Design a protein around this ligand. Sequence first.
Ligand SMILES: CC(=O)N[C@@H](C)C(=O)NCC#CBr
Ligand SMILES: [Cl-]
Length: 130
Amino acid sequence: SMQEEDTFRELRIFLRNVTHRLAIDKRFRVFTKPVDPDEVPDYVTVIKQPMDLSSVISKIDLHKYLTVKDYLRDIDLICSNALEYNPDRDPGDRLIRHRACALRDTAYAIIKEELDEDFEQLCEEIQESR
Ligand SMILES: CC(=O)N[C@@H](C)C(=O)NCC#CBr
Ligand SMILES: [Cl-]
C-alpha cells in the first residue's frame, strides 16, 4: 500500500540521518570508503563481505533495508570485519578495533534514543507480510 511505502520512506530518511552522523565523525573516516586493494591486496581474500558507510548509503537508496535490524547487521559487519582483519596487539590494529567498536556502539546508542520501538515493529510486520 502507499501507507507501507510511506513507512519504508520514513525508515530510509531515519537510516540516512544515522549514517550521515557516523560518516562525519573524524574517528570513523577509515570506515567511510571501501578498503583500497592497492594498499591492502589481501583484504578482499580475508574479508568475504566488505562493508563501509558508503556501501550502507548505497544500500539504503537501493531499498535493501526494510527494518532497522537489517541495517544494524551491516553496521555489525563493519565492526566484526575490523576485529577479524586487525586482531594484533600493536597500536595500529588496537586503534582500528577501538574505532570499529565505537562506530557500532554509537549507531546502537542513536537507535536506542531515537528509534520508536513501535515504528520498528511496524517495519518488521510489513517485511514479514511480503
Ligand atoms: C578497515 C580496515 O580494516 N582497514 C585496515 C586494512 C587498516 O589497517 N586500516 C588503516 C587505515 C586507514 Br584510512
Ligand atoms: Cl588517524
